[PDB]
Amino acid sequence: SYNFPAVNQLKSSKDIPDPFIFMDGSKVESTDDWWKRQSEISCMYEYYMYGKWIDGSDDETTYSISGNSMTINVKRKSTGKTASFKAVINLPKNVRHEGGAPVILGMHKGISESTATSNGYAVITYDSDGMFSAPGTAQDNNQHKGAFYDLYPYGRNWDEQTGDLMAWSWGISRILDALYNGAAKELNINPDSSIVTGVSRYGKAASVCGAFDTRIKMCAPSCSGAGGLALYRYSSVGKTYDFSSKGGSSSYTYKENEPLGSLQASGEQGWFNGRFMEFRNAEQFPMDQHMLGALCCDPDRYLFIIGSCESEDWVNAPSVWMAYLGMKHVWDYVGISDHLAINIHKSGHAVIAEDIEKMVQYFDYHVYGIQPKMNLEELQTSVFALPKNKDSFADTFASKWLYDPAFLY
């Protein structure tokens, strides 16, 4: 449903919104109520932030493979229009999972592909470097040009506006369609064992992709920052942390975090929808990004958050950590606490080798029953949980929520 108030009619609050309160003020009182609230949250994100999700109901996908180059061809059934875009295949030399290799679907090249393939996982990414060459589905700008927009033009009404993050997500869905439609058998991939990942602006994209294409088994957004998984309402500027347990500095003080106006600037607004430009303060959002993450909460799915302690203060890892703490309430309420994971590594604005290694051990355990070598409890905490690094905010932000049981964190 999209019968939502205009932005200028929204109440403002500094509190982190309760995921368990519906827009109309009614309460989640059962897990069945949660599934309904999750659907509402999904619609709210379309309406206020990312644009209309295009779910593939109108798309017919075919493909071709030449060496490691994959061409994805899409026809929009109602209009007859066609578009195409390119992806890159990386297969493991040895498949070790019955039913085919798991597949990491990447928003761009350069996500530690060789670590994945050495561990038996396939990787298919857009033929994009994550910077100068954007995915073929949409150029990285505010003019909305590319294979997605050739089929779904960016128009004047809100339902006609789908931002670049959703355009990039749509192409991942079409790659997955091609896999189910024959490509997975050709490549010795299990298309049900799917992961989506990407970094920075493409980490925002990966979060959106997992939230909206619920077929993808694990969502793994890296260093996604503002408009990704960071809380809009939590600032870490001027806070000091001890990162020595991770090999970092024993007294590291964060500089600036990205603020709302930076997301609304010409170089970033294309990622969002037109309605997003109406917001003036973070306190106006009828959500915060723990709720975007919670769109991936499901008994058959997993969310694996990646971020960094040092050298990327703008993407606000402490606020991503706070959002993760909020998400823990939802995953615990549904009874699947271990389906939520987080790796705050020392540094690297990237998906680095240890991220892949830990993703593989985690996914192998939950999806295949393979016992891990590592202690998976390490993915259920971070350096921000050390008492000396704790903000009192962590213990109070959820205190008004309907579900705030003791000892979640």
Author numbering: 366 to 774
Sentences copied from the publication:
Glucuronoyl esterases (GEs) within the carbohydrate esterase family 15 (CE15) esterase family, in a range of aerobic and anaerobic fungi and bacteria, have been identified as playing an important role in breaking down LCCs by cleaving the ester bond between 4-O-methyl-d-glucuronyl in xylan and alcohol groups in lignin. GEs share an invariant Ser-His-Glu/Asp catalytic triad and employ a conserved catalytic mechanism that involves the formation of an acyl-enzyme covalent intermediate, which is subsequently cleaved through acid-base hydrolysis. Rumen GEs adopt a canonical α/β hydrolase fold: FsCE15, PrCE15, and RfCE15 adopted the canonical α/β-hydrolase fold that is seen in all of the GE structures solved to date. The fold of all three enzymes consists of a central twisted 10 stranded mixed β-sheet flanked by α-helices on either side.
RfCE15 is the C-terminal GE domain of a multi-modular enzyme from R. flavefaciens called CesA. The structure of RfCE15 was refined to Rwork/Rfree of 16.8%/19.0% using data with a maximum resolution of 1.25 Å. The catalytic residues of RfCE15 are observed in a non-canonical configuration, with the putative general acid Glu677 located on a loop at the end of β8; making RfCE15 a member of the CE15-A GE subfamily. The general base (His714) is located on a loop directly above the catalytic serine, but is shifted by 2.2 Å relative to the position of this loop in FsCE15 and PrCE15. The shift in this position accommodates the non-canonical conformation of the general acid residue. Despite the shift in Cα of His714, the imidazole ring occupies a similar location as that found in the other GEs, with His714 Nε2 making a 2.8 Å hydrogen bond with Oγ of Ser565, and a 2.9 Å bidentate hydrogen bond with the carboxyl functional group of Glu677. Most notably, a 16 amino acid insertion from residues Gly603-Tyr619 forms an extended Ω-loop that wraps around the backside of the general base loop. As observed in other CE15-A subfamily GEs, the conserved disulfide bond found in CE15-B GEs, was not observed in RfCE15. Instead, these residues are Val564 and Val715 and form a hydrophobic pocket that is composed of an extended network of Van der Waals interactions between Ile114, Ile121, Met228, Phe314, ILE316, Ile366, and Met369. In contrast, the addition of reducing agent to RfCE15 did not alter its thermal stability, an observation consistent with the lack of disulfide bonds.
